[PDB]
Design a protein around this ligand. Structure first.
Ligand code: HEM
Ligand SMILES: CC[C@H]1OC(=O)[C@H](C)[C@@H](OC(=O)CCN(C)C)[C@@H](C)C[C@@H](C)C(=O)/C=C/[C@H]1C
Length: 397
C-alpha cells in the first residue's frame, strides 16, 4: 500500500460538507488508508475511535519532522521548532515555558474581559435594523483573535492580516498560496518579536523575548518564533470554527436549542457536544511513525505522514451511540476534540471559556435566534484537518 485509494480533492464540496460516509466506508475496511489530500499531500488516515485514541498518544508516532521522510519546505522550516511539532525532551521544555499562562485558574482571570468583548460584539450585531447578520463575521471571527492578540501583544491594526493568512493555510487557492502565507506571517512575527526587544512590554511575547535573549539555550530564536506562531494559529481556526460550527449545530437542531434555552445549566454539556459532533479539528496534526507500525495487518512505513481522523472517532457507534444525533445531554466523555496524551490542547480552558460565554450571550440576547439560510447554502472548507464554514447567516426577532 503505497498508491492512494482516494483523492479527496476529486470528491469536491460534497466531501467538504459531509465527509462522514467517506470516513465510515474506510473504517469498515480497516483502520488505516492512503489518501491524497485536496492540497495534494499523500498521507495515511487512521479511522475508528479506539485506534484514533491510541495513535494520538502512542510515542511510536513522533511529531518531529526529523522523523518524516517528506522534507519541510523553506517556509515551513522557519516555523517547525514549536511544541506541537516536537517530541520529549523538546516538547516538555517548550510547553513548561507557557503552561502557567494557560491553566484553568489563570484563564479564569480573563473572564471579565472575554465577557466584555462578547457583549460589545453582540450589542453591535444586534443593532442591524433588519435583525440579520453573519455570526461568523459578527462574533466567531473577532472574539478569539481579540483575546489571543491581547495576551500575546499583537497590535490591533495587525490582527486582520491573520484572518487572511490563516484562511490561506486552511483553504489555499494553490500550494504556492499556503507557502506565501506562511512566509508572510513568519516575516511579520519576526518583526513583531524584534519590535518587543528593549520595550519593557508585559505581554506574553515580550516575556518570551526576554527569556530567549537572557538564555538562548532555554528558548532559541527559532523556538521563540515557533511559539508565537503556534499560540496564534493553533488556537485560531479552531476556536473561531468551534463557535460557528457549534452554533450551526444548535440552530440546525431546534429541539436542542429549545432544551438549552429552557435549561441553561445544560450549557457546558452543550459545548462539549458541539466539540464531539461539530468540532473544528477534523483530523489531528501530522504524525510520523519512527518505525513501521502494524495496525491490524495494515503496515504504515516509518516516516510516512499520518492523520488521525477525529471526526470519524466521534461517529464510532461503539463509543458514541446514535452518533449522528446532536444531543446536548449526551455523555461526551472520551471525546478527542482537544487531542489526547502529551499534546493535549493547552488552550482548552481558554477555548471553553470563550465558547461558553459566546453561546450563552447569543442565547440570552437573541430572541428566536435562527439560521437565515437553508443548510445547503452553507459552504465548507475542504481541508481534511479543519472543519469550517465560510459564513453563518443568522436572524432574530
Ligand atoms: C476549541 C478550540 C480548540 C480546539 C478544538 C483545539 C484543539 C487542539 C487539538 C486537537 C490539539 C492536539 C493536536 C494533535 O494532537 O495533533 C491541540 C493542541 C494545541 N493547542 Fe489547541 N485547540 C483549541 C484552542 C486552542 C487555543 C485557544 C490555544 C492557545 C491559546 C491552543 C493552543 C494549542 C497548542 C499550543 C497545542 C500544542 C500543544 C502541545 O503540543 O503540547 N488551542 N489543540
Ligand atoms: C490543532 C491545532 C491546529 O493545527 C495547527 O496549529 C498546525 C500545527 C498548523 O500547521 C503548521 O503550523 C505547520 C507548520 N509546520 C509544517 C512547519 C496549522 C496552520 C495547520 C492548518 C491546516 C490549521 O489551521 C489546522 C489547525 C488545527 C488542526
Amino acid at each position: 500500500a503505497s498508491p492512494p485509494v482516494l483523492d479527496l480533492g476529486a470528491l469536491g464540496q460534497d466531501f467538504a460538507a459531509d465527509p462522514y460516509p467517506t470516513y465510515a466506508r474506510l473504517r469498515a475496511e480497516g483502520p488505516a488508508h492512503r489518501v491524497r489530500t485536496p492540497e495534494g499531500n499523500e498521507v495515511w488516515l487512521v479511522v475508528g475511535y479506539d485506534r484514533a485514541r491510541a495513535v494520538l498518544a502512542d510515542p511510536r508516532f513522533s511529531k518531529d519532522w526529523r522523523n518524516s521522510t517528506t522534507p519541510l519546505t523553506e517556509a515551513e522550516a522557519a516555523l517547525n521548532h514549536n511544541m506541537l511539532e516536537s517530541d520529549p525532551p523538546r516538547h516538555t521544555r517548550l510547553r513548561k515555558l507557557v503552561a502557567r499562562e494557560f491553566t484553568m485558574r489563570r484563564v479564569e482571570l480573563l473572564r471579565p474581559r472575554v465577557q466584555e468583548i462578547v457583549d460589545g460584539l453582540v450589542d453591535a450585531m444586534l443593532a442591524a435594523p433588519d435583525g440579520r447578520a453573519d455570526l461568523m463575521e459578527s462574533l466567531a471571527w473577532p472574539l478569539p483573535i481579540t483575546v489571543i492578540s491581547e495576551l500575546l501583544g499583537v497590535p490591533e491594526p495587525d490582527r486582520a492580516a491573520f484572518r487572511v493568512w490563516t484562511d490561506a493555510f486552511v483553504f489555499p487557492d494553490d500550494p504556492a498560496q499556503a507557502q506565501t502565507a506562511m512566509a508572510e506571517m513568519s516575516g511579520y512575527l519576526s518583526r513583531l518579536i524584534d519590535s518587543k526587544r528593549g520595550q519593557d512590554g508585559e505581554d506574553l511575547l515580550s516575556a518570551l523575548v526576554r527569556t530567549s535573549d537572557e538564555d538562548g539555550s532555554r528558548l532559541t530564536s527559532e523556538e521563540l518564533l515557533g511559539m508565537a506562531h503556534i499560540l496564534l494559529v493553533a488556537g485560531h481556526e479552531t476556536t473561531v470554527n468551534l463557535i460557528a460550527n457549534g452554533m450551526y449545530a444548535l440552530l440546525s437542531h431546534p429541539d436542542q436549542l429549545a432544551a438549552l434555552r429552557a435549561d441553561m445549566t445544560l450549557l457546558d454539556g452543550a459545548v462539549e457536544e458541539m466539540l464531539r459532533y461539530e468540532g473544528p479539528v477534523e483530523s489531528a496534526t501530522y504524525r510520523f511513525p519512527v518505525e513501521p507500525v502494524d495496525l491490524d495487518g495494515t503496515v504504515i512505513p516509518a516516516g510516512d505522514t499520518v492523520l488521525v481522523v477525529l471526526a470519524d472517532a466521534h461517529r464510532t457507534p461503539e463509543r458514541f451511540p446514535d452518533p449522528h444525533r446532536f444531543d446536548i445531554r449526551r455523555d461526551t466523555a472520551g471525546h478527542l476534540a482537544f487531542g489526547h496524551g502529551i499534546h493535549f490542547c493547552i488552550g482548552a480552558p481558554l477555548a471553553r471559556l470563550e465558547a461558553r460565554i459566546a453561546v450563552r450571550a447569543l442565547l440570552e440576547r437573541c430572541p428566536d435566534l435562527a439560521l437565515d439560510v437553508s443548510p445547503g447554502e452553507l459552504v465548507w472548507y475542504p481541508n481534511p484537518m479543519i472543519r469550517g464554514l465560510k459564513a453563518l447567516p443568522i436572524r432574530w426577532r
